[PDB]
């Protein structure tokens, strides 16, 4: 039992406690949306994690994302580019990311 009609993020859709704390958090994330997927029940702070997982969401059959060359499950396509570019260059090593 409660009501909220103002003091909420235009991008989270989540109610808050003060319009300035609303403003500063809406800048310190940006991200996209409440990070929440509507097809998975998943969320994580980055921007491009969601826009990539969104455009890679097409009829995966399992309501969870996976590397279509492995069949191996992984949260988002940005972590897969970092898996694929090194977890497939030496044999299935300690997942140490695409970097220089
Ligand atoms: Zn927000
Ligand atoms: Zn999803
Ligand atoms: Zn893979």
Tell me, yes or no, whether 72 lies in a domain.
Answer: yes
Q: Is 73 helix (H, G, I), strand (E, B) or coil?
A: strand
CA-CA distance, 29 to 60, in Å (whole number)?
Answer: 28
Q: Is 22 part of a structural domain of the chain?
A: no
Q: How many structural domains does the chain have? A: 1
Q: Is 88 helix (H, G, I), strand (E, B) or coil?
A: strand
CB-facing half-sphere around the CA of 94: CA atoms within 13 A = 0
Tell me the CA–centroid distance for residue 76 and ligand 2, in Å: 9
What is the Cα–Cα distance from 15 to 49, expressed in whole angstroms?
24
Q: Is 29 among the annotated ligand-binding positions?
A: yes
Residue 52 is assigned to a structural domain of this protein:
yes
The ligand whose atoms approach the alpha carbon of 14 most closely is: 1
Q: Is 44 annotated as a binding residue?
A: no
Residue 68 in domain: yes
Residue 18 domain-assigned (yes or no): no
């Amino acid at each position: 039992s409660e009501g909220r009609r103002s003091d909420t993020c235009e991008y989270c859709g989540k109610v808050f406690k003060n319009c300035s704390n609303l403003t500063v958090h809406r800048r310190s994330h940006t991200g996209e949306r409440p990070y929440k997927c509507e097809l998975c029940n998943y969320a994580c702070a980055q921007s491009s994690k969601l826009t990539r997982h969104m455009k890679t969401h097409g009829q995966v059959g399992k309501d969870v994302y996976k590397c279509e060359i492995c069949k191996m499950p992984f949260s988002v396509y940005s972590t897969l580019e970092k898996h694929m570019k090194k977890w497939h260059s030496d044999r299935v090593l300690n997942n140490d990311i695409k970097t220089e």
